Amino acid sequence: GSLIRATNLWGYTDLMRELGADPLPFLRRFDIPPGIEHQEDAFMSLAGFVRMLEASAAELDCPDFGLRLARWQGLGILGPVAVIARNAATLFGGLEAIGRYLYVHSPALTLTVSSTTARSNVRFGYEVTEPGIPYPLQGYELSMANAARMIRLLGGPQARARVFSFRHAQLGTDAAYREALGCTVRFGRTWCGFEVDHRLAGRPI
Numbered sequence: 176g177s178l179i180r181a182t183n184l185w186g187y188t189d190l191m192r193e194l195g196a197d198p199l200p201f202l203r204r205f206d207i208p209p210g211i212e213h214q215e216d217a218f219m220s221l222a223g224f225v226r227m228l229e230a231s232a233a234e235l236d237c238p239d240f241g242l243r244l245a246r247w248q249g250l251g252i253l254g255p256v257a258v259i260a261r262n263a264a265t266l267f268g269g270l271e272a273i274g275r276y277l278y279v280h281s282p283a284l285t286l287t288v289s290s291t292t293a294r295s296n297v298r299f300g301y302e303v304t305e306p307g308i309p310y311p312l313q314g315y316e317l318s319m320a321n322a323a324r325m326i327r328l329l330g331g332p333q334a335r336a337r338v339f340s341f342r343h344a345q346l347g348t349d350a351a352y353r354e355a356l357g358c359t360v361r362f363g364r365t366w367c368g369f370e371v372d373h374r375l376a377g378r379p380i
């Protein structure tokens with residue numbers, strides 16, 4: 176089964192404590208080594224991680240778990256791939272380098288970067304593909320809240336996607352999504368990801 180960089184666990188302990196829950200029984204349940212959160216260059220089971228996020232959200236009645244966990248994460252969780260991104264010439268180049276090398280973060284993640292004459296914007300379509308996992312709802316929300324953070328780091332602090340899209344229906348509150356994502360958020364759609372207009376995409380880092 177695919178691994179994912181254990182930086183994607185950053186904040187797990189802190190958030191679980193914030194919610195009054197003990198993180199250790201969850202980590203043991205999903206076969207995530209305790210302490211791996213703070214072990215640089217370590218990697219964890221993607222399947223165990225996505226299931227743990229679901230379990231945390233369900234059992235603590237925290238529908239915005241993944242959105243909230245992003246506050247401890249952002250671009251730095253990409254480790255070597257962040258170094259590459261920050262070195263690009265423009266926001267488009269930084270995001271497209273993340274896409275090219277996202278397998279280094281996890282082989283189960285695919286980013287498709289597309290622009291067409293027929294539609295506005297550059298689209299960043301995102302997929303988690305791993306044999307046998309439940310649909311990773313909390314994982315997708317964590318991924319998009321992280322992406323909004325990456326856009327602000329690479330694009331400057333007023334930078335925003337034009338839209339975020341999810342495959343699932345809205346779970347958390349309107350306020351939760353607006354605070355994490357900002358822009359227009361579309362739910363229940365055929366694709367997951369975000370779009371950036373060409374003005375922003377062309378902005379130098």
Ligand SMILES: O=C(CCC(F)(F)F)N1CCC2(CC1)CC(C(F)(F)F)=NO2
Pocket residue numbers: 179183225253270273274280284286299301303311313314315317318319321322323325
């Ligand atoms: O949080 C995750 C993955 C979480 C989960 F594994 F899917 F559960 N990230 C960070 C964001 C992203 C995927 C992995 C998307 C992205 C970009 F450039 F599109 F904005 N870079 O890394």
